[PDB]
Design a protein around this ligand. Structure first.
Ligand SMILES: CCCCCCCCCCCCCCCCCCCC(=O)O[C@H](COC(=O)CCCCCCCCCCCCCC)COP(=O)(O)OCCN
Ligand SMILES: NC[C@H](O)c1ccc(O)c(O)c1
Ligand SMILES: [Cl-]
Ligand code: NA
Ligand code: NA
Lengths: 116, 551
C-alpha cells in the first residue's frame, strides 16, 4: 500500500489547486481515503469514503472538493477559493479499504501548498 | 500487519447485538421488574437508558471505531485514564466467571430436556427431598424448584458461602463444553465469532416471540401482565429501584465491559456507529420488555395453577428462568419441545455474550501487549482456562452463593463507576468537542447537542448519583432465606473495589513514572500520546478554560 501525493505548489489567495493521490496496493474505490494538512497539528480536511460519500472539514467545506478516479486509482482534492490559512503540507491517508480489509492508516509523504 | 476489519457490516452488527442481547435480558431484567413492583422498575430503566446507556453505548462505539484500539489502549487520547480500560477488562473477566456457569446451567437443562418425561415435572427422583409436593396436582419443595436446587445445583449440600463444597462434575462437564465452544469461537480472531453469531444472535428472537405469543394466551397470564404493567410510584422514592435500573442498563447493554470498544475497533472508519448504537439499544430494550412480558405471563399462569398469588411463585436469582418457566413448560402439551427451544434460546443468548465479554479482554490486553497479539490462540486459551478455573467456584455445592456475590459486586457499583470514568475522561479531559470532531471526521456530522450534553453533564451526573447512593444504600447480601456472613459482604466490596481502584492506582502510577515537573507530568497524563510533543511547547488545551467550557 502506497500513497504518492502531487499537485502542490505556490498559489495566490483566491486561487485553485488540484492535489492528486496516486494510490497503489489497494483499490481507492472501496477505500476510506482522507486528506489532512499540517500548517499546528494535522487537521482532517476531506474524505471520500468507502461507498463514495464525500465529507469535508468545516474549514474547507464549500471550497474543497474531494474525488477519486477509479481507473487511475487516484484521489483528487480540488481546493478552490484558497486562503493564506490553507498553506500547509497536505497529507493523503487511507484509513482502510472498506469491509473485509485491513486498517492501513497509511500516510503519504505530503505535498506542500503555499497560498500567498 | 495492519489491524483487520470485519468481513461485513453484518458481522459487526450481529456481534454487537449478540453481546448486547444476552442472558441478562431474560434472567436479570424480569426479576428486577418483579422485585421492584413491576412497571415501577420500567420508568427508571427507560430513563437511565435514554440519558446514560444509549449515550454511552454510542460513545464506546465511536471511541473504538475512531481510535481502533481496545478498552485499555484506547486511553492514549487521555493517558491518565488507562486504569478505566483496565477496570472494564477486569469487570468483564469477573462477569465471565459466573456468566458461563449460567450458560452451563442452560446446557445442563437442555441435556435434561431430551426426555419425554422432564425431570422437573414430578418428584420421586434421587434429588427429591421427602417434602417434595406438586401444589398444582412451600414453593421451594416443588418438583421444579427441587430439581434446580438439588439435582442441578446440589445447594442442599451447602450450608452457605463458608461451606461451598467441591465442584459438581455434571456442571463441570457442561462448563467444559461452554468454554471449549468459546475458545473455538474466539481463538482465530473476530472473523470466526462474527460468522458464529449468525445463529446465536438470531434464534433467541424467534424462540422469545413464540414464548410470548403462547404465554399471553395461558390462563391467568392477564394477572401477570397487569402486575408487569402496574406502576407503584411510591417505589420510585426508594434508591434500590434506581440503582437496580442503572446497573441493569449497563450490565445488559454491555457498556462498561470494553466489548463495544473492542468490537468497533475492527470497524471501517466510515461505519455509522451512531445508528448501530441506536439499533442495538432499541433491540436490547425491546428484548428486555418482551422477555419481561413472557416471564410475567408465566408468573400469572403459575399463580393461577397453584391457586396462589404471583408473589408466592416468584423466586430470587435465576429462579424465574430455571424453576418457574420449566414448571410452566412441564404443564404444557409437547413440553419436551418447549423445554428444548427454551434452553436452546438461553444457550444462544448466553454464548455470544460470553464471546463478546472474552473478546473484550483478549482485544484489550493484546492491544496493550503485542506479544499477546501475535499469540492469539495461546492467549485465548489462557483467558478461557482462567475463566473456567475461576468459574469452578460457582459450580460447587454452594456455587449459587458465589454466583450471587459475583452478580452483585463484579459489575454493580464497579461498572457504573467505570462508565462514569469513561464519560468523564472522554468528555472533560480529552474533550467532548474533540470527540465530536472525531465523530464528524468518521461520519461527516457532529453528534447533536443532546449527545454531547449527555456525555459531559447528564450521564456523568446520574452515574455519580447512582454510584454514591449504591454505596450509601447498600444492603447486606442475601440469597432467599440465607444471609451472607458479614465477611462475604467485605469480600464482595473488595471485588468491586478491585476494579474501581485501578483508576486512581493507574493515575498515581502514570504521574510517578512520568518525568518532569508537576505541571509537565499532568500535561503528559492528560495530553494524547501522539500530541506529547506539545507539552514542551506549552500548548495544553486542558490548561485553559475554553477546553472545560465546551458544552
Ligand atoms: C484483566 C485486568 C486488567 C489487566 C491489567 C494489566 C496491567 C499491567 C500494566 O502494564 O500496568 C502497568 C501499570 O498498571 C498499574 O499500576 C495499574 C493497573 C503499566 O501500564 P502501561 O500502560 O505502562 O503498560 C504497558 C503495557 N505494554
Ligand atoms: N451482560 C453481561 C455480558 O453478557 C458479559 C460481560 C462480560 C463477560 O465476561 C461475560 O461473560 C458476559
Ligand atoms: Cl435488560
Ligand atoms: Na447474547
Ligand atoms: Na442485554
Amino acid at each position: 500500500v502506497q500513497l504518492v501525493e502531487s499537485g502542490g505548489g505556490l498559489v495566490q489567495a483566491g486561487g485553485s489547486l488540484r492535489l492528486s493521490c496516486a494510490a497503489s496496493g489497494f483499490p481507492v474505490y472501496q477505500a476510506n481515503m482522507y486528506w489532512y494538512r499540517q500548517a499546528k497539528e494535522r487537521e482532517w480536511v476531506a474524505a471520500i469514503q468507502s461507498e463514495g460519500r464525500t465529507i469535508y472539514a468545516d474549514s474547507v467545506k464549500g471550497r474543497f472538493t474531494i474525488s477519486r478516479d477509479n481507473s487511475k486509482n487516484t484521489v483528487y482534492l480540488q481546493m478552490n477559493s484558497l486562503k493564506p490559512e490553507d498553506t500547509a503540507v497536505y497529507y493523503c491517508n487511507v484509513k482502510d479499504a472498506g469491509w473485509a480489509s485491513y486498517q492501513y492508516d497509511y500516510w503519504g509523504q505530503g505535498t506542500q501548498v503555499t497560498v500567498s | 500487519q495492519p489491524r483487520e476489519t470485519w468481513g461485513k457490516k453484518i458481522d459487526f452488527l450481529l456481534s454487537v447485538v449478540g453481546f448486547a442481547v444476552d442472558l441478562a435480558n431474560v434472567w436479570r431484567f424480569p426479576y428486577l421488574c418483579y422485585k421492584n413492583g413491576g412497571g415501577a422498575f420500567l420508568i427508571p430503566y427507560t430513563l437511565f437508558l435514554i440519558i446514560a446507556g444509549m449515550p454511552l453505548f454510542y460513545m464506546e462505539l465511536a471511541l473504538g471505531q475512531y481510535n481502533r484500539e481496545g478498552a485499555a489502549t484506547v486511553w492514549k487520547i487521555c493517558p491518565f485514564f488507562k486504569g478505566v480500560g483496565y477496570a472494564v477488562i477486569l469487570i468483564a473477566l469477573y462477569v465471565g466467571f459466573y456468566y458461563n456457569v449460567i450458560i452451563a446451567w442452560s446446557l445442563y437443562y437442555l441435556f435434561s430436556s431430551f426426555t419425554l418425561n422432564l425431570p422437573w415435572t414430578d418428584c420421586g427422583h434421587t434429588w427429591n427431598s421427602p417434602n417434595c409436593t406438586d401444589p398444582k396436582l412451600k414453593y421451594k419443595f416443588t418438583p421444579a424448584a427441587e430439581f434446580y436446587e438439588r439435582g442441578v445445583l446440589h445447594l442442599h449440600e451447602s450450608s452457605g458461602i463458608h461451606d461451598i463444597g467441591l465442584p459438581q462434575w455434571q456442571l463441570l462437564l457442561c462448563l467444559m463444553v461452554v468454554v471449549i465452544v468459546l475458545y473455538f469461537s474466539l481463538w482465530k480472531g473476530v472473523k470466526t465469532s462474527g460468522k458464529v453469531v449468525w445463529i446465536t444472535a438470531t434464534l433467541p428472537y424467534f424462540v422469545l416471540f413464540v414464548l410470548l405469543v403462547h404465554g399471553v394466551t395461558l390462563p391467568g397470564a392477564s394477572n401477570g401482565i397487569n402486575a408487569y404493567l402496574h406502576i407503584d410510584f411510591y417505589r420510585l422514592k426508594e434508591a434500590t429501584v434506581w440503582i437496580d435500573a442503572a446497573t441493569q442498563i449497563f450490565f445488559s447493554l454491555g457498556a462498561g465491559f470494553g466489548v463495544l470498544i473492542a468490537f468497533a475497533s475492527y470497524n471501517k472508519f466510515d461505519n455509522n456507529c451512531y445508528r448501530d448504537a441506536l439499533l442495538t439499544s432499541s433491540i436490547n430494550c425491546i428484548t428486555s420488555f418482551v422477555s419481561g412480558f413472557a416471564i410475567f405471563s408465566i408468573l400469572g399462569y403459575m399463580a393461577h395453577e397453584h391457586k396462589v398469588n404471583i408473589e408466592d411463585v416468584a423466586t430470587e436469582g435465576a429462579g424465574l428462568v430455571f424453576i418457574l418457566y420449566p414448571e410452566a413448560i412441564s404443564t404444557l402439551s409437547g413440553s419436551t419441545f418447549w423445554a428444548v427451544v427454551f434452553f436452546v434460546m438461553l444457550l444462544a443468548l448466553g454464548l455470544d455474550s460470553s464471546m463478546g465479554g472474552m473478546e473484550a479482554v483478549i482485544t484489550g490486553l493484546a492491544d496493550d501487549f503485542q506479544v499477546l497479539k501475535r499469540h492469539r490462540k495461546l492467549f485465548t486459551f489462557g483467558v478461557t482456562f482462567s475463566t473456567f478455573l475461576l468459574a469452578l467456584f460457582c459450580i460447587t455445592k454452594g456455587g449459587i452463593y458465589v454466583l450471587t456475590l459475583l452478580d452483585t459486586f463484579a459489575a454493580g457499583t464497579s461498572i457504573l463507576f467505570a462508565v462514569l470514568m469513561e464519560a468523564i475522561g472522554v468528555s472533560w479531559f480529552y474533550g467532548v468537542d474533540r470527540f465530536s470532531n472525531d465523530i464528524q471526521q468518521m461520519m461527516g456530522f457532529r453528534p447533536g447537542l443532546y449527545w454531547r450534553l449527555c456525555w459531559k453533564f447528564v450521564s456523568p451526573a446520574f452515574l455519580l448519583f447512582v454510584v454514591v447512593v449504591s454505596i450509601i444504600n447498600f444492603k447486606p447480601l442475601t440469597y432467599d432465606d440465607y444471609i451472607f456472613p458479614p465477611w462475604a459482604n467485605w469480600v464482595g466490596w473488595g471485588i468491586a473495589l478491585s476494579s474501581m481502584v485501578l483508576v486512581p492506582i493507574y493515575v498515581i502510577y502514570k504521574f510517578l513514572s512520568t518525568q518532569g515537573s508537576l505541571w509537565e507530568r499532568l500535561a503528559y497524563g492528560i495530553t494524547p500520546e501522539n500530541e506529547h510533543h506539545l507539552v514542551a511547547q506549552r500548548d495544553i488545551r486542558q490548561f485553559q478554560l475554553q477546553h472545560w467550557l465546551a458544552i
